[PDB]
Amino acid sequence: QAALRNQQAMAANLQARQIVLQQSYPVIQQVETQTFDPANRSVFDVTPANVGIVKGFLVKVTAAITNNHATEAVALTDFGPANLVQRVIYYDPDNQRHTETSGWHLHFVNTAKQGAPFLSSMVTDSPIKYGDVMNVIDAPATIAAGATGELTMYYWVPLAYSETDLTGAVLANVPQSKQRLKLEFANNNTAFAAVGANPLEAIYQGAGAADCEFEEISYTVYQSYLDQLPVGQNGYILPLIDLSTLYNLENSAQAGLTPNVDFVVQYANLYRYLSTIAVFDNGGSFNAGTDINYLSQRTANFSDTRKLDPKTWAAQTRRRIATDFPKGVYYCDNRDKPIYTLQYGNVGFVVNPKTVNQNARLLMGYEYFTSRT
Amino acid sequence: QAALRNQQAMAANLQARQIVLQQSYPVIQQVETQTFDPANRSVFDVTPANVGIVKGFLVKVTAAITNNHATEAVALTDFGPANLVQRVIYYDPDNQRHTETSGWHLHFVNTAKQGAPFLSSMVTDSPIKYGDVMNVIDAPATIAAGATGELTMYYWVPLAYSETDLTGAVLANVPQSKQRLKLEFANNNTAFAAVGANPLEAIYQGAGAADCEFEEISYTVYQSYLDQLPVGQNGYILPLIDLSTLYNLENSAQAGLTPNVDFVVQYANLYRYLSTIAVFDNGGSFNAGTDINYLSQRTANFSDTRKLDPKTWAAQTRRRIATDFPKGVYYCDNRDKPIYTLQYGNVGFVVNPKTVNQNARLLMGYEYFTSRT
Amino acid sequence: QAALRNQQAMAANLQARQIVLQQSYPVIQQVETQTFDPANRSVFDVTPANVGIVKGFLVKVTAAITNNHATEAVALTDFGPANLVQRVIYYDPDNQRHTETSGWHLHFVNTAKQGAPFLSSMVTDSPIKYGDVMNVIDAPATIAAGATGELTMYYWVPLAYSETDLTGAVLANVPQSKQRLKLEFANNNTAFAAVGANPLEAIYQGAGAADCEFEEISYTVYQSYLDQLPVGQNGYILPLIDLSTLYNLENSAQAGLTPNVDFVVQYANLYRYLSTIAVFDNGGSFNAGTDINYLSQRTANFSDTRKLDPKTWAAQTRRRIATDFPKGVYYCDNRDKPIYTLQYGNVGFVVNPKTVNQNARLLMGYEYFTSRT
Ligand SMILES: CN(C)CCCN1c2ccccc2Sc2ccc(Cl)cc21
Ligand SMILES: CN(C)CCCN1c2ccccc2Sc2ccc(Cl)cc21
Ligand SMILES: CN(C)CCCN1c2ccccc2Sc2ccc(Cl)cc21
Ligand SMILES: [Cl-]
Ligand SMILES: [Cl-]
Ligand SMILES: [Cl-]
Ligand code: NA
Ligand code: NA
Ligand code: NA
Ligand code: NA
Ligand code: NA
């Protein structure tokens, strides 16, 4: 029977993973640093090193922003420094595409995976001076007229699903085939939004936005990988299922929302969706659930497995990340039982809006597994 | 002789639990919503759905409170919106009671099980606008004279011990049996305490309390259960030990405290106590340990397993929920090694007070397992 | 080869550990309490009880500090009340030394092991009055001229590695035992640093420091151990490897730093280093990474396994303890793969400074396993 072959192949994959993790040599190492002015260039193609099993990339981004307006200030948007990177794209040595998503979606996934705001500093009552000492992720709440602010942001670009689950990792042992990590950074057009404009992709918004400009952006890419891979009789001990599976983040935009009607976003088939993020960009307005009747995941036979009002939806998210996502951002965890259908559209994500402004749209971000072939 | 029969029956139960969790698909859906004026009615009986394996109920409570006093305001008590529900009682299909406890004890257990204040929003230094966006559990610190405040509270009523441990869950396949979830809500008599009165059960206290009233109370009950239970050769694959065990929360009151003398609350026998909460209601005064010499758990043979000063007792609790329970509330975790005696009164919970005001009492809250037969 | 014997002995050690943890009687009880004036005495030798397997000691320290200066105030140092204990040393019944380290290093390890500032109270949006109720660890941020402040501090002195890993525990059944816990407390010379002086070891610093004095210090030592050890056919069931292993905390000082040059602190051999703490005492100045180029761990010729700038180094720490350590404190976790070297100097901890003041030094704190023989 073929079901036993599967059982055997998965047991062997798990065994190989455990052997690799036990015997391999975990390394994190810089591969590239660069400082630039986004007025000159904002898209960069980073070439990682071809060594061992690649697990992911830590992208450090710093920036200096000057407000040269005469009188008016500017204030952080909801996403703030998470919009320093507009887009990230990874291609493996076979030129197979993995993650392609926005900076803010990648950041929200980093938060979901950590269980708390990514790389944040928790506030406590400790008299010992713990706290925001090193400003790992940091941005001034406002930039006054004539002032210059310093920003720092970190993104984890995952290939492997986690430090102990190598599903999605990349074997980069061929010298000639090239990894490609594409970073598209913010610039003076995307980062600053005037009053009344849509702040989705911007870092600061306010009456002084027209006279704000980047002084510089700097990035440093660190590559996390496993060296000194174990070797056995038949050859390198490798988890074949893990290394032949893609773990990808992607996002898309959907429109056509109308008040009091279910707006359904179908899940594709053959993808194992681990998480879903839905941002209700209600025509440049981001509200704390007040413009939604309910959200749900639905099988299409009218059976809702979790049809909830917005506050109760947020309650489940508070159990995942110990806080709320920013206004208009809704998270759905399916990690223990991924959405997996055999026929396209057998499951959908549902938002029933109560208020729909002009140009309202739903930005969907997905976390999923899929096989190469 | 029969130790293997036990071992076998336990191995079968565990395996069946894993199969049920693996093959069934979890569902959470609304079962009842109602708005009312506590001046007319404050006791309600919710009728859950009889489907699959029932794990628990999420009770969302919203309320509007108006301070009609001319000049004086009111402020939250230590328990605040946790007293929106005064009492909860659950009857399973076979008319067996599970949880029967107060709202504040249920909330403190929800917190203990989460490892942090239930459904709270942690504060961090993140510049990304995480935080208290959705006001999942919320209540104004004060309600000024003439003002109206909005409250939201959530309670999880557990049947199953947790999402992965179905001990205590309820099989709702029986045709002739109605579950009963009984909820007693706060009213205009319990929710508001005058200056100098006992705030234990109240939501607000202050000089304006006599003229405070509910505008309205609303509740929504969600039921969490497992559907599509797996079927095997003999029939449904079910963990018989899990479904024949009761996971209950209960509360009691004890009086007779006198300064500098050990006040002992005996644990009953046949119950496997998982946690203990002791509230020192010192005649309407709730103090931060300054009225207690020490607390302990003690066996009949005179041995103290943890006789500690109140600060050190609170230190262990800080390792459990990352903060302190409100003033006068003391928590004891026995989940790894439940208090389980064969003879009533073999083990007791000890409080040695140093100050005892008139009408002092110890409100006990218990979390325990027990068998149906 | 006979390496099978190891396999068997370790499987037997883990089996004996599991049996002891299941059958034994966990107890935490007070062994000594004393109030003293540090002007008279600040060094104490605590004699624990000789019962069962000893896992560790919880040291509660309270203090009253008066600022007698006429006009000036004092403010907490970065380490603050963690310097109430200057040094702690444990000797087992065989007079073998286990932990020998400073108070601040012990506290930082307690924090690393908890995953958050040790015994801290997290801040949340909860309206229920959770929070800093009991002041488990507490110290006023400043003490005004003429004012008296009250301090409370807790240290966990570990013998066993954790509550479930008895590696490092001590068997205390032999009479004529020399079990000794030595505590060297702060006094009126170490606790108070003048402006411009080195605040490393002090609790308060400021222009009023010269006139600050302890009114009193009090300590209470609790001993955590296992009673009622199980007895088998051959005799007492004991994990021989666990009880013959030392789990120690130690610290040392290192000097000879020069700008832009790698300063390497070699790891000794035969020690299994679990964690490393490095404090850059830059001549009494403690900076948030701005005086360091990068930190790293490095092999003889296998290069750097994690060569990172200070902010990225701090990012990894934020994933461990949900915040930053105080200024100048850098943490490195090696718990899953301890640094174990066949030959001395095979591995080293590296700091490359960019600014080195006079009398700069690197205070190293280590967590490690080692065998008795
Ligand atoms: C898929 N299902 C297992 C999830 C049910 C989790 N469910 C829960 C369970 C155990 C303890 C506390 C809670 S609170 C809660 C709050 C909001 C929501 Cl939406 C659900 C829950
Ligand atoms: C009763 N026993 C099983 C628990 C001992 C736990 N014990 C402990 C152990 C390992 C690391 C840190 C700590 S802190 C602590 C603080 C207060 C109290 Cl009361 C106990 C402890
Ligand atoms: C420990 N290293 C060897 C493994 C890479 C961990 N790596 C990581 C991995 C998975 C998810 C998020 C992160 S963030 C991060 C931040 C700073 C640093 Cl220094 C590393 C990481
Ligand atoms: Cl009504
Ligand atoms: Cl003295
Ligand atoms: Cl680390
Ligand atoms: Na250009
Ligand atoms: Na709130
Ligand atoms: Na009334
Ligand atoms: Na405090
Ligand atoms: Na002095």
mmCIF file of N, CA and C in Angstrom, chain A residues 48 54 57 67 82 106 138 149 156 163 183 188 194 208 210 223 248 273 278 290 311:
data_model
loop_
_atom_site.group_PDB
_atom_site.id
_atom_site.type_symbol
_atom_site.label_atom_id
_atom_site.label_comp_id
_atom_site.label_asym_id
_atom_site.label_seq_id
_atom_site.Cartn_x
_atom_site.Cartn_y
_atom_site.Cartn_z
ATOM 1 N N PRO A 48 23.269 35.782 -1.233
ATOM 2 C CA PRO A 48 23.805 35.048 -0.080
ATOM 3 C C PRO A 48 24.912 34.091 -0.493
ATOM 4 N N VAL A 54 20.420 26.544 4.437
ATOM 5 C CA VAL A 54 20.090 27.930 4.752
ATOM 6 C C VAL A 54 18.719 27.966 5.412
ATOM 7 N N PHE A 57 17.138 34.710 6.807
ATOM 8 C CA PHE A 57 17.934 35.928 6.756
ATOM 9 C C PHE A 57 17.380 36.949 7.736
ATOM 10 N N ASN A 67 12.669 66.185 8.669
ATOM 11 C CA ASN A 67 11.489 66.989 8.381
ATOM 12 C C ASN A 67 11.959 68.428 8.185
ATOM 13 N N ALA A 82 7.912 49.377 10.154
ATOM 14 C CA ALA A 82 7.738 48.142 9.401
ATOM 15 C C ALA A 82 7.599 48.397 7.905
ATOM 16 N N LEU A 106 5.472 40.629 6.503
ATOM 17 C CA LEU A 106 6.567 39.847 7.064
ATOM 18 C C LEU A 106 6.749 40.155 8.543
ATOM 19 N N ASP A 138 12.957 50.628 16.724
ATOM 20 C CA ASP A 138 12.798 51.947 17.318
ATOM 21 C C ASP A 138 12.498 52.982 16.245
ATOM 22 N N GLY A 149 15.168 62.316 12.734
ATOM 23 C CA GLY A 149 14.942 61.144 13.557
ATOM 24 C C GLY A 149 15.671 59.925 13.024
ATOM 25 N N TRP A 156 12.907 39.195 9.925
ATOM 26 C CA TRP A 156 13.379 37.831 9.743
ATOM 27 C C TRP A 156 12.717 37.277 8.489
ATOM 28 N N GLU A 163 13.553 27.200 14.049
ATOM 29 C CA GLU A 163 14.896 26.732 14.371
ATOM 30 C C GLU A 163 14.958 25.222 14.561
ATOM 31 N N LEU A 183 15.425 43.074 -2.032
ATOM 32 C CA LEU A 183 14.860 44.013 -1.078
ATOM 33 C C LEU A 183 14.486 45.291 -1.813
ATOM 34 N N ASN A 188 11.185 58.467 -0.687
ATOM 35 C CA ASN A 188 10.491 59.688 -0.290
ATOM 36 C C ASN A 188 9.063 59.755 -0.809
ATOM 37 N N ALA A 194 0.628 62.669 3.174
ATOM 38 C CA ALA A 194 -0.009 63.909 3.575
ATOM 39 C C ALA A 194 -1.244 63.611 4.425
ATOM 40 N N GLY A 208 3.380 68.054 7.547
ATOM 41 C CA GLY A 208 4.711 68.313 7.045
ATOM 42 C C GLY A 208 5.256 67.268 6.096
ATOM 43 N N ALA A 210 5.040 66.650 2.932
ATOM 44 C CA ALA A 210 5.553 67.051 1.628
ATOM 45 C C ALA A 210 7.019 67.461 1.673
ATOM 46 N N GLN A 223 22.960 35.890 7.346
ATOM 47 C CA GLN A 223 22.471 34.609 6.865
ATOM 48 C C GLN A 223 22.593 33.577 7.975
ATOM 49 N N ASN A 248 6.400 29.659 2.416
ATOM 50 C CA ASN A 248 6.326 30.949 1.751
ATOM 51 C C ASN A 248 5.349 31.880 2.451
ATOM 52 N N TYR A 273 -2.258 26.331 4.183
ATOM 53 C CA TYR A 273 -2.235 27.658 4.784
ATOM 54 C C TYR A 273 -2.077 27.556 6.297
ATOM 55 N N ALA A 278 -5.635 39.665 7.476
ATOM 56 C CA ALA A 278 -6.537 40.481 6.674
ATOM 57 C C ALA A 278 -6.501 41.905 7.207
ATOM 58 N N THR A 290 -14.748 48.514 14.370
ATOM 59 C CA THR A 290 -16.055 49.155 14.364
ATOM 60 C C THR A 290 -16.726 49.140 12.997
ATOM 61 N N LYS A 311 -14.394 41.848 18.345
ATOM 62 C CA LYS A 311 -13.738 41.788 19.649
ATOM 63 C C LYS A 311 -13.368 40.358 20.023
#
